[PDB]
Design a protein around this ligand. Structure first.
Ligand code: RN2
Ligand code: RN2
Ligand code: CL
Ligand code: CL
Ligand code: CL
Ligand code: CL
Ligand code: CL
Ligand code: CL
Lengths: 221, 221
């Protein structure tokens, strides 16, 4: 596998978005993974609607601004037959009545693939051969809220008790040695003013740090 | 006109490039504008060759790594009958022999449209209705070099004596009021590591700040 991967360089990733005061991280992780797979299939990078996911996927078990899961989002897209563009269905960061229109759909999926739980080498393989991957992580620490640069490593991080969905867009290493200071390249949904212009490097191959490989998945397009 | 526009979210913009040690900003601004118009016309996003413009547009009045102008680059593409892909004519950040190959051409233009000098409302209309727009600006400040986040506003900026070509990919505002804290969304060519993932927000409707609306143009495809 490559020593480094960054899907941003290949046209798979939309700009950093901001969920604002709504617990919709799962919808942003899901649209980021679907954006990547739809681009891999058609060559067109089109921002997808998190608001469509927040408003319309309660039947699949999501709870809008009160939380949800990327897999349930991919299930909704499948049961629904489509997902609207962000342009047609804008994000307002609150729970609202479903406004989905098939005429505005720009994406579809047949379900999703799960990466082997807890296996960082399985995740590395999926990132290198599929594109961006939705993952869950433990973001419940002030060190993450205030993160700025470098490789994120939090001693109190859990790999089991996760509370935030994000998008792995690559991996790499700091310094000249490929096996030293490895990291996962993660796109957050807290705007570009958070972290390193909206991104964070999370320690890689350090015992599934913060649970990045515990519950990873991607849509099948 | 829309309250905000972001052509990156619609597939019109290639990933951020890096001119390195060559004064070829004008060529990157020109390829970015043609990449957007060729995508609007065909639905295919193809990276274009800045190196073809650097090496071949001296007859039109450009000077390669010593500087140039987007309008002269669109004139070269028109007179030349085409422009090659980045893949077929790679960027090497130095003045080299013209190696234009018609069989590798993936873009054409019949000339260009200019935006009336100094008219930010005319620039806003062009961005909303056409796609990304080539523009000149005053980038000669340490504040721009070390720019990292927020709306860029530099007191020492000129709206008349400009030195750097960039690409306006959209516009927006901060918060709920669409008329307050407005900005131009600008793609630079100093690599993704510069600024905010290679982008900068420049103050909009603040007296043509840094000259963004002084010499704007786009190719006619
Ligand atoms: C991130 O913005 C949110 C914050 C939720 C605060 C209330 N986190 C989630 O949505 C999280 C993401 C997974 C760990 C990937 N899931 C979650 O909180 O789900 C809650 C839930 C429980 C049962 C049924 C539906 C949702
Ligand atoms: C940006 O990389 C370059 C830096 C040039 C350093 C020498 N800027 C330009 O090319 C600039 C862009 C315009 C303002 C849009 N143009 C410029 O410097 O042109 C110089 C020139 C004069 C006469 C004939 C050709 C070129
Ligand atoms: Cl971004
Ligand atoms: Cl999930
Ligand atoms: Cl490794
Ligand atoms: Cl010009
Ligand atoms: Cl002309
Ligand atoms: Cl306005």
């Amino acid at each position: 596998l490559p020593k480094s991967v960054d899907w941003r360089k290949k046209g798979y990733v939309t700009p950093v978005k901001n969920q604002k005061q709504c617990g919709s991280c799962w919808a942003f992780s899901a649209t980021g993974a679907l954006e990547g797979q739809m681009f891999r299939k058609t060559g067109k990078l089109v921002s997808l609607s998190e608001q469509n996911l927040v408003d319309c996927s309660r039947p699949q078990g999501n709870q809008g601004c009160n939380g949800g899961f990327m897999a349930r989002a991919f299930q909704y897209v499948k049961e629904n037959g489509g997902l609207d563009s962000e342009e047609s269905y804008p994000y307002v960061a609150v729970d609202e009545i479903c406004k989905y229109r098939p005429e505005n759909s720009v994406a579809q999926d047949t379900g999703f693939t799960v990466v082997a739980p807890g296996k960082e080498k399985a995740l590395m393989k999926a990132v290198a051969t599929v594109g961006p991957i939705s993952v869950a992580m433990d973001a419940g620490h002030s060190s993450f809220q205030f993160y700025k640069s470098g490789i994120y490593f939090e001693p109190d991080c859990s790999s089991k008790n996760l509370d935030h969905g994000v998008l792995v867009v690559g991996y790499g290493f700091e310094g000249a040695n490929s096996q030293n200071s490895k990291y996962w390249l993660v796109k957050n949904s807290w705007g570009p003013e958070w972290g390193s212009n909206g991104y964070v490097k999370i320690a890689k191959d350090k015992n599934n740090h913060c649970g990045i490989a515990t519950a990873a998945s991607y849509p099948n397009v």
